[PDB]
Design a protein around this ligand. Structure first.
Ligand SMILES: *[C@@H]1O[C@H](CO)[C@@H](O[C@@H]2O[C@H](CO)[C@@H](O)[C@H](O)[C@H]2NC(C)=O)[C@H](O)[C@H]1NC(C)=O
Ligand SMILES: CC(C)CCC[C@@H](C)[C@H]1CC[C@H]2[C@@H]3CC=C4C[C@@H](O)CC[C@]4(C)[C@H]3CC[C@]12C
Ligand SMILES: *[C@@H]1O[C@H](CO)[C@@H](O)[C@H](O)[C@H]1NC(C)=O
Ligand SMILES: [K+]
Ligand SMILES: [Mg+2]
Ligand SMILES: [Tl+]
Ligand SMILES: [Tl+]
Lengths: 39, 268, 992
């Protein structure tokens, strides 16, 4: 917007962290699954 | 030789020459495409400069400016940087209707020169006289520090509204058009005196938004001179200058995020 | 020091009984005086063995703390505290950087110390096992009276008494004996009881009957003797000292480790000081000049590599534990793969160590029995009525019996009370005719004449199990020729017939052939006594010939030997196909040694000794060109008078070598001889007479079930199931781990470049620091760890058992070809991918690449809280630093992303991934966990403080992707060239 362009200097680092941690966890689980296919 | 024969030494050179040549050519290629994705007028991200920093002229050894009044070369270090800044706000530097403009001698509203486009020439910036900085060689006794708000493209500094209570409760509250700056230390052993545009202790909103170096060269940002004619002597005084606003915030880590940290000591 | 002990012993068995007493001031009848014995005790010292001085574990741990990498990491750790000290004095720095980094680095050294300490283990209790062979007490005659004393109180000169069941307390001169037999397997590896008597019977004291040795035991009878040697001075006490004293030495794998440590340490100190001066010339304060150096150290040293090696070794040892192959020393996991020569004991190693029936001669025909443990062969005969007649004599004319409670274990494995030949016959019949006890119940023995020294035969009279007869049957066995002189008829295919010169000659032929096979041959015959001349109550006199022992019926011959273990012949061939030379080294007699050599394939068909040529051509041995003989058989008595140079010629000039009747020191000498030629040697054995050889071997392998305690103490590896096929597996595993270590090392080293280059450009370019010191440790100690380990699970790229053993002088673990690829090619591509992401982060935040050159001065200036970017914006100190640390984080993640491809390319040295596939599940695990770790380190809240890791935006992850891919393609194209032309260019330059 014009004088109300506050969103330009903002970033949702909170969501990014939530998503990043979700991904890291799921990649960790997936890895266990493939490894445990025989121990 | 060490490793191989001459014939082998050559071949290993012909390889790494072509190899590193290709790698350099590829690296450069990826730099090209990166630049191709970027604007010339505005950076891709601005969230890391977001809350504006407040910086001053006196080059602090460690957020400190200690010196002796009864000594000449005791403050000549801080006068070097003080001069460096103010030397830019000369009238001879601001000549003709291009690229400067005479703006309200009193704090006014924002000025939009269109978009961040080259569809116009150099966006015309507001003039600023160093003569608006009353009282301030500089203050040989009781320094005359000069404040400054860090430039951010497209940033509209918004002052606080007088809805509720305020630190400098309602005094000279130019609510609509001034970004205030109140310095503090309890520990009230000083004498705060502020100088600026229109005589106000703030930044005139008519100097915003900044259009960037590419669209606004020679542009001048507003200054706020602060003088501490304190009646005390020979002690470290931790003075903090704070700016207030809707778009202004602070951090415990970044001690320059919209504020000062000055340790004055007139040890004379 | 031990050169004296490598020699054959001298003795006094030639002296008379009386003469021997003069030498030791002793009485043959009364024995020593209580006072004289005590005098000699203080004089000579105790009858005991003293363990050699060991190196305390303290010094062993700390010796690792100073080996190249640890030295450099120490210099870094101290240089951290140096810069910290210089700070704490000058400008009060409230930070924790140099202090904490100095603590972290010192911990890295200590923990790395534990890993190398675990790898360099030496579990040796040789002298302890020997000490276990000295009895607690001994029986001596002192002042004309016998008393038990502490065996340590035994001295040279006293009169000692031994009987069946006790250990020989010291080396004795036999002066009196009654039916005394002894087990000399300690000195020979052969357990067949040896008679002891006062009479001298051989010039060689290790063969004479009038000497009994410490480390052996009396098996039966009784004997008295004069002590000639005590403690360390006994024959086997010296073997003890020799074995326990032998310097261990460095393994092939250990030597390789130290070698690349020198290389990497070299480049480290080179670039280290090369850029330390390069910085001072550029006008960098010593305050900074050291900080850069610390970074250089951390970049160059692969902090997690030595521990990787240890883990890869450990994991390989775990797989072998699961095949009944115990590894006592982690490094011995690889030595077997580098082995070019095997020196093998015969008895209990190549052989089962059990007299077993091998052939039978009946019906004018040679039949072969199955000698294998698990009986993997086939039948020979069951139909012939002759067989049942021979079978009956083998069961009936036999006094051996199975021990109680064995019905659970297999026939051939069960313990038997009796001599070896009777046990063999027992197990033979029990196997192919069912319960022998049944046959001995159906045919009650009424009278017998046990085998006599003079008779040379054993006879028995039984009540025929037949109801229509129920009469008296006579059976006998003995020396083949003696049995022949007592026969008139031969049981041919059922019916008897006269013994004509024809069948008599066929007997001699059969007899000579079986004997030629190194087999012990016995004759078997029976006689159905006439009914009218022998009533159902007729008494037989065993003392005086009350019955005919002539004109009997010859039934057949039976031959026997201590046979090879089932898997041994095939394992020997497999070792030989892998280009390993196999030598036999045994305490056993030459005829037996040679026969098993041919049986297991040590001596291949057609190959001759000089003696074979001479006999075939009917010419003198001196007339034979010795170069015409590729095979040789050396008796220990001849070995004794040969110099080592002459032993070296024997080793060089023969492909098929048998060392027979060797002493324990002689085995050591042969091992050393092989090593002297530059060969990596394995020893396989099971006896105490293998102990010195096992110790000296680059790798000693002991048998687990049949092995003596001493042998297993001297070994690096134990075959817990006595499965000789494990040697073949061991060499295969050893070769595989050697290749996989290269892959894992290249992988680990490759990521050094992207950690070095940022520090260099930081100096030469004056740009903001692309990657931090902490960030490097997050790679080498964090992300790269599991991937690097996972390479240990790689399958072979080709048939490794088809290639020759590596040349330890030329074929190195880390060579110039590895460095060229890891440092010069792949690591260089990784460095760029790192830098790219660095420029991306900065440029997208407003600092374009062009304006970055020569900005570090203002960038690092803590007092400039207004640096101008390319777009004209102003940054505080902490703001720009957050972007900088975000650059460290994405550079870090870029390494991880480019290590993805590197992990896949390091999978194979030659083959394509499209050929080798992706069947390594540990490797895939590594990829997932590596990425999980990196993501966690970036996104986990608080890690921005502890490690300066900042959250990355999604687009950031993909910066290095095009570089990761170029690596995969590049290496795949390169290896395509290798395969397409075995010539050499790409091969001799980059083939690890
Ligand atoms: C900007 O203004 C300052 C004001 O102090 C100028 O300083 C002058 O310097 C000259 C020569 O050194 C002196 O003679 C004068 O006394 C100073 N003041 C004035 C008001 O003229 C400075 O030169 C100016 N800089 C530029 C680039 O124009
Ligand atoms: C950061 C940049 C400027 C550094 C570049 C370093 C280059 C020149 C280095 C890195 C790895 C190096 C190579 C590594 C391996 C070998 C094989 C050896 O048998 C001869 C030297 C040779 C061929 C080296 C020559 C120089 C080399 C290519
Ligand atoms: C500042 O200077 C003015 C003259 O320009 C003078 O009148 C005044 O006293 C000064 N103020 C202070 C606080 O010293
Ligand atoms: K050994
Ligand atoms: Mg043996
Ligand atoms: Tl490293
Ligand atoms: Tl590394």
């Amino acid at each position: 917007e014009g004088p109300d362009n506050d969103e330009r200097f903002t970033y949702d680092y909170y969501r990014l962290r939530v998503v990043g941690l979700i991904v890291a966890a799921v990649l960790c689980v997936i890895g266990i699954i493939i490894l445990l296919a025989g121990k | 030789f060490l490793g191989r024969t001459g014939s082998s030494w050559f071949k290993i050179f012909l390889f790494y020459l072509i190899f590193y040549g290709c790698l350099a050519g590829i690296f450069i290629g990826t730099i090209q495409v990166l630049l191709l994705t970027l604007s010339d007028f505005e950076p891709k991200y601005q969230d890391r400069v977001a809350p504006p920093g407040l910086s001053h002229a006196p080059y602090a050894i460690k957020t400190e400016i200690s010196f002796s009044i009864s000594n000449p070369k005791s403050y000549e270090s801080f006068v070097k940087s003080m001069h460096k800044l103010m030397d830019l706000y000369n009238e001879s530097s601001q000549a003709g209707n291009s690229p400067f403009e005479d703006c309200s001698d009193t704090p006014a509203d924002y000025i939009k020169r269109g978009d961040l486009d080259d569809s116009q020439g150099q966006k015309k910036a507001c003039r600023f006289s160093r003569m608006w900085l009353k009282n301030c060689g500089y203050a040989e006794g009781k320094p005359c520090v000069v404040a400054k708000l860090n430039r951010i493209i497209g940033f509209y500094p918004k002052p606080l509204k007088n809805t509720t209570d305020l630190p400098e409760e309602l005094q000279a509250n130019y609510n609509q058009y001034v970004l205030p700056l109140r310095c503090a230390a309890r520990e009230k052993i000083g004498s705060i005196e502020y100088f600026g545009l229109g005589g106000y202790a703030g930044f005139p909103l008519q100097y915003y938004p900044y259009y960037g170096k590419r669209l606004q060269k020679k542009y001048l940002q507003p200054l706020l001179a602060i003088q501490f004619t304190n009646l005390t002597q020979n002690m470290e005084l931790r003075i903090e200058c704070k700016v207030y606003g809707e778009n202004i915030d602070y951090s415990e880590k970044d001690r320059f995020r919209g504020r000062f940290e000055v340790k004055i000591e007139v040890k004379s | 020091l031990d050169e004296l002990k490598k020699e054959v012993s001298m003795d006094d068995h030639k002296l008379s009984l009386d003469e021997l007493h003069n030498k030791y001031g002793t009485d043959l009848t009364r024995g020593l005086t209580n006072a004289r014995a005590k005098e000699i005790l203080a004089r000579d010292g105790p009858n005991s063995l003293t363990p050699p001085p060991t190196t305390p574990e303290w010094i062993k741990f700390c010796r690792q703390l100073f080996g190249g990498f640890s030295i450099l990491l120490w210099i870094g750790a101290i240089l951290c505290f140096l810069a910290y000290g210089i700070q704490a004095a000058t400008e009060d720095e409230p930070a924790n950087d140099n202090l904490y980094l100095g603590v972290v680095l010192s911990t890295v050294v200590i923990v790395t110390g534990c890993f190398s300490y675990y790898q360099e283990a030496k579990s040796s209790r040789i002298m302890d096992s020997f000490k276990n062979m000295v009895p607690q007490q001994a029986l001596v005659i002192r002042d004309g009276e016998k008393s038990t004393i502490n065996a340590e109180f035994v001295v040279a000169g006293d009169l000692v008494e031994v009987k069946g069941g006790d250990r020989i307390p010291a080396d004795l001169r036999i002066i009196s004996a009654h039916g005394c037999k002894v087990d000399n397997s300690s000195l020979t590896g052969e357990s067949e009881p040896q008679t002891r008597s006062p009479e001298f019977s051989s010039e060689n004291p290790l063969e004479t009957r009038n000497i009994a040795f410490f480390s052996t035991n009396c098996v039966e009878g009784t004997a008295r003797g004069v002590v000639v040697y005590t403690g360390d001075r006994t024959v086997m006490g010296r073997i003890a000292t020799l074995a326990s004293g032998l310097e261990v030495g460095r393994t092939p794998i250990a030597i390789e480790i130290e070698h690349f440590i020198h290389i990497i340490t070299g480049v480290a100190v080179f670039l280290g000081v090369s850029f330390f001066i390069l910085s001072l010339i550029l006008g960098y304060s010593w305050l900074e000049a050291v900080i850069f150096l610390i970074g250089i150290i951390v970049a160059n040293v692969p902090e997690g590599l030595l521990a990787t090696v240890t883990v890869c070794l450990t994991l390989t040892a775990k797989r072998m534990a699961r095949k009944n192959c115990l590894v006592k020393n982690l490094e011995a996991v690889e030595t077997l793969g580098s082995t070019s020569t095997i020196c093998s004991d015969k008895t209990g190693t190549l052989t089962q160590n059990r007299m077993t029936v091998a052939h039978m001669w009946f019906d004018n025909q040679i039949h072969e029995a199955d000698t294998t443990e698990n009986q993997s062969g086939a039948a020979f005969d069951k139909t012939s009525a002759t067989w049942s007649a021979l079978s009956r004599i083998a069961a009936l004319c036999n006094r051996a019996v199975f021990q109680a409670g064995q019905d659970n274990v297999p026939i051939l494995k069960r313990s038997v009370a009796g001599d070896a030949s009777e046990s063999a016959l027992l197990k033979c019949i029990e196997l192919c005719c069912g319960s022998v006890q049944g046959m001995r119940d159906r045919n009650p023995k009424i009278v017998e004449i046990p085998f006599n020294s003079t008779n040379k035969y054993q006879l028995s009279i039984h009540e025929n199990e037949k109801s229509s007869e129920s009469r008296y049957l006579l059976v006998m066995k003995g020396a083949p020729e003696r049995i022949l002189d007592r026969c008139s008829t031969i049981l041919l295919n059922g019916a008897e017939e006269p013994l004509k010169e024809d069948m008599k000659e066929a007997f001699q032929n059969a007899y000579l052939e079986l004997g030629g096979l190194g087999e012990r041959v016995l004759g078997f015959c029976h006689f159905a006594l006439p009914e009218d001349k022998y009533n159902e109550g007729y008494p037989f006199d065993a003392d005086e010939p009350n019955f005919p022992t002539t004109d009997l019926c010859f039934v057949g011959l039976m031959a026997m030997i201590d046979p090879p273990r089932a898997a041994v012949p095939d394992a020997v061939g497999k070792c030989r196909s892998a280009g390993i030379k196999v030598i036999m080294v045994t305490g056993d007699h030459p005829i037996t040694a040679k026969a098993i050599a041919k049986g297991v394939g040590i001596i291949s068909e057609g190959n001759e000794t000089i003696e074979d040529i001479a006999a075939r051509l009917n010419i003198p041995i001196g007339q034979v060109n010795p170069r015409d003989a590729k095979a040789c058989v050396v008796h220990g008595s001849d070995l004794k008078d040969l110099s080592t140079e002459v032993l070296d010629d024997i080793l060089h000039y023969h492909t098929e070598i048998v060392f027979a009747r060797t002493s324990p020191q002689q085995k050591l000498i042969i091992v050393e001889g092989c090593q002297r030629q530059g060969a990596i040697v394995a020893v396989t054995g099971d006896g105490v007479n293998d102990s010195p050889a096992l110790k000296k071997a680059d790798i000693g392998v002991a048998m687990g079930i049949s092995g003596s305690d001493v042998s297993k103490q001297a070994a690096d590896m134990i075959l817990l199931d006595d499965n000789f096929a494990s040697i073949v597996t061991g060499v295969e595993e050893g070769r595989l781990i050697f290749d996989n270590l290269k892959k894992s090392i290249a992988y680990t080293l490759t990521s050094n470049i992207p950690e070095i280059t940022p520090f260099l450009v930081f100096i030469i370019g004056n740009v903001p620091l692309p990657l931090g010191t902490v960030t490097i440790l997050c790679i080498d100690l964090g992300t790269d760890m599991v991937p690097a380990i996972s390479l240990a699970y790689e399958q072979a790229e080709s048939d490794i058992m088809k290639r020759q053993p590596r040349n330890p002088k030329t074929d190195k673990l880390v060579n110039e070809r590895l460095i060229s690829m890891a440092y010069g090619q792949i690591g260089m591509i990784q460095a760029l991918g790192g830098f790219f992401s660095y420029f991306v982060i900065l440029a997208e935040n407003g600092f374009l690449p062009m304006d970055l050159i020569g900005k570090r001065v203002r960038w690092d200036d803590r007092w400039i809280s207004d640096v101008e970017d390319s777009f004209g914006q102003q940054w505080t100190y902490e703001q720009r630093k957050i972007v900088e640390f975000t650059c460290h984080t994405s550079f870090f993640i870029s390494i991880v992303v480019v290590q993805w491809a590197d992990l896949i390319i390091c999978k194979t040295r030659r083959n394509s991934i499209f050929q080798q596939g992706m069947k390594n599940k540990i490797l895939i695990f590594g990829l997932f966990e590596e990425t999980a770790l990196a993501a966690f380190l970036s996104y986990c809240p608080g890690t921005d403080v502890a490690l300066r890791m900042y959250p990355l935006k999604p687009s950031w992850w993909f910066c290095a992707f095009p570089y990761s891919l170029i690596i995969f393609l590049y290496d795949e194209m390169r290896r395509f060239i290798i395969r397409r032309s075995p010539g050499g260019w790409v091969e001799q330059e980059t083939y690890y």
